[PDB]
Design a protein around this ligand. Structure first.
Ligand SMILES: Nc1nc2c(ncn2[C@H]2C[C@H](O)[C@@H](COP(=O)(O)OP(=O)(O)OP(=O)(O)O)O2)c(=O)[nH]1
Ligand SMILES: [Ca+2]
Ligand SMILES: [Ca+2]
Ligand SMILES: [Ca+2]
Length: 341
DNA sequence: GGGGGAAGGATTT
DNA sequence: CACGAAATCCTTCCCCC
């Protein structure tokens, strides 16, 4: 079982770079301006020239402006990146059929066939990096191991613009040397729940009774960590398919006024439908980010599809339902459509 | 007891 | 201060064999 993971480097930043070469070399920060005030918003991502000074995805634009005032700040253009991504995903098909597109810039290729050992894998890794750097002028980091989880950790260790093979000899030492927090799927919250159990490496999972672990982190993730530590993880690569579409927007001000909110909620629906393009959804949820970044949502599943007019009608009710309960002001508002016909 | 759908959340990338 | 989008998993509630 040989898995090849491809991760496009500082993707958005790099695309903006590609589209305007003069930018290369300078510190670039791709932003998402909320429009509340001046420079309100957050960082979608940044290139390494900015990354090394602490400017990273998540921080407010204002905190980034404070660290690197003379860096280039571009608005985020999601659509563009999307089409550059897909074109690259096509070039990857010319190397395998068994492909899983995890995100806008991640992909696992099952190449157990077209190879047989790692020496001929590290080669296909270079055939792919170079191929991509050529047709689209974009650098990627390749990771190669026996399963998706390790294929990915490989890339993490080798980025940016790198390639790495995690055979088996080392997979053994990693199950003991790797910090549990650096395991895909283990977030900050899960990483911390694992300290209170004495789990600081994968191996420590074998030392704990399964039930005390299922109670702390749930069964799924428990069976996940164990399988990996017990070195028998083998999830397959498969074609993932869109299950939901949506959009959440930020309001210029926080409010509880229905008539003051409806315009944002409607614009969200309008955009969601544009993206739905031909897909008919049976389920709708109205999501809201309260005044203290807490996520609230209400929904309804219908026996039939949902016409645009129905959606308008329903969303207004679901929002009212939200204001009925939570007495907190609303900062962000949006919708999501699922259960397509 | 346990299937199976719903809904509202939690957590991760 | 602190945007966005989508997946999976969890706990709870419910109708009913
Ligand atoms: N709006 C927004 N976009 C994000 C965020 N994190 C990642 N993205 C987007 C833009 C990133 O270029 C893209 C790929 O994510 P990583 O692959 O997580 O980001 P990036 O490629 O810059 O770093 P990397 O190549 O993985 O070392 O996803 C985020 O927190 N907010
Ligand atoms: Ca990544
Ligand atoms: Ca990446
Ligand atoms: Ca992690």
């Amino acid at each position: 079982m040989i898995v090849l993971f491809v991760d496009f480097d500082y993707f958005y930043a790099q695309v903006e770079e590609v589209l305007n070469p003069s930018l290369k070399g300078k510190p670039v920060v791709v932003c998402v301006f909320s429009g509340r005030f001046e420079d309100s918003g957050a960082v979608a991502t940044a290139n390494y020239e900015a990354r090394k000074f602490g400017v990273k995805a998540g921080i407010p634009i204002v905190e980034a402006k404070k660290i690197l005032p003379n860096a280039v700040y571009l608005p985020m253009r999601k659509e563009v990146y999307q089409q550059v991504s897909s074109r690259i995903m096509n070039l990857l098909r010319e190397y395998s059929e068994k492909i899983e597109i995890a995100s806008i810039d991640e992909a696992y290729l099952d190449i157990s066939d077209k190879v047989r050992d790692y020496r001929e894998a590290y080669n296909l890794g270079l055939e792919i990096k170079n191929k991509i750097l050529e047709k689209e002028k974009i650098t990627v980091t390749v990771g190669i191991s026996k399963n998706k989880v390790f294929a990915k950790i490989a890339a993490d260790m080798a980025k940016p613009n790198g390639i790495k093979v995690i055979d088996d000899e080392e997979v053994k030492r990693l199950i003991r040397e790797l910090d549990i927090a650096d395991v895909p799927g283990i977030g900050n919250i899960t990483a911390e729940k694992l300290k209170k159990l004495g789990i600081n490496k994968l191996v420590d999972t074998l030392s704990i009774e399964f039930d005390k672990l299922k109670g702390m982190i749930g069964e799924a993730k428990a069976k996940y960590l164990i399988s990996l530590a017990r070195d028998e993880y083998n999830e397959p690569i498969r074609t993932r398919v869109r299950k939901s579409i949506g959009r959440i927007v930020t309001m210029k001000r926080n409010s509880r006024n229905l008539e003051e909110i409806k315009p944002y909620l409607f614009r969200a629906i309008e955009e969601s439908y544009y993206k739905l393009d031909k897909r008919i959804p049976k389920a709708i949820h109205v999501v809201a980010v309260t005044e203290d970044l807490d996520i609230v949502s209400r929904g309804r599943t219908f026996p039939h599809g949902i016409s645009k007019e129905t959606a308008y009608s329903e969303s207004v009710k679901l929002l009212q339902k939200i204001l009925e309960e939570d007495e907190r002001k609303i900062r962000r508002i949006g919708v999501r459509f699922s259960k397509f016909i």
